[PDB]
């Protein structure tokens, strides 16, 4: 089956990022942190270059503020994990293969679109 | 300061035994530790042909929102989990993972998460 990527736009750079329910934290991998230009937001107080506390991250046509952590070498550009999915009151909506947000639905990537 | 969001767990029963699964949509497969499988009497249904993976079951009910659903699952004995509901389950029963209202919705029924207390 394929795994659930939703695409979004961070400062206009656009980023495949990857749904997981069973991720407690979110984590964006260094080099797609340096690609949006987000590095200088990087509270740096090992593998974590820091957290970046607010960002917007263009999702679903709406302009959501995210909240992440930055490493390096992480396979994932980046992950939404379960600390954002409940602060914005997502839903992971498998019957129709979509993330909603404010009833507003984001359809999942297909596999060709995959990373 | 800090702050921690209660993982993802619903109840359900397997042969009338009470387990607590753990929701994860990042993950491929589902999966039961050898011990859930164990005290749930399931050991005799798993098939043989493949941290050793004992294997797989390919069809037990799962009581899971009042209703017995099929449920495929793989068996490894190493896995702190209990057991691990996989996107594979989750979408052959076109689940809904609800977090605006903190359920796990299947057929409109909805199973509440459970709260941090009643985690493994």
Redesign the interface.
């Known amino acids: ?1 394929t ?2 990527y939703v695409p979004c736009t961070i400062n206009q750079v656009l980023v495949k990022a ?7 934290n979110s984590i964006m991998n260094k080099r797609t942190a340096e690609r949006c230009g987000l590095m200088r937001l990087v509270d740096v107080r090992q593998e974590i270059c820091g957290r970046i506390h607010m960002t917007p991250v263009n999702l679903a046509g709406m302009y959501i503020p995210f909240a992440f952590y930055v490493i390096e070498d992480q396979a994932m550009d980046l ?1 939404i994990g ?2 954002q ?2 602060r914005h ?7 129709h293969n979509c993330l909603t947000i404010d009833n507003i639905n984001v359809p999942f990537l297909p596999e060709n679109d995959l990373p």
Do not use: T
């Not at 990857?18 to 407690?24: E, L, P």
């Not at 009151?89 to 019957?95: F, W």
């Open positions: 089956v795994m659930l990857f749904v997981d329910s069973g991720a407690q992950i379960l600390d999915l409940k009151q997502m839903m992971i909506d498998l019957k």
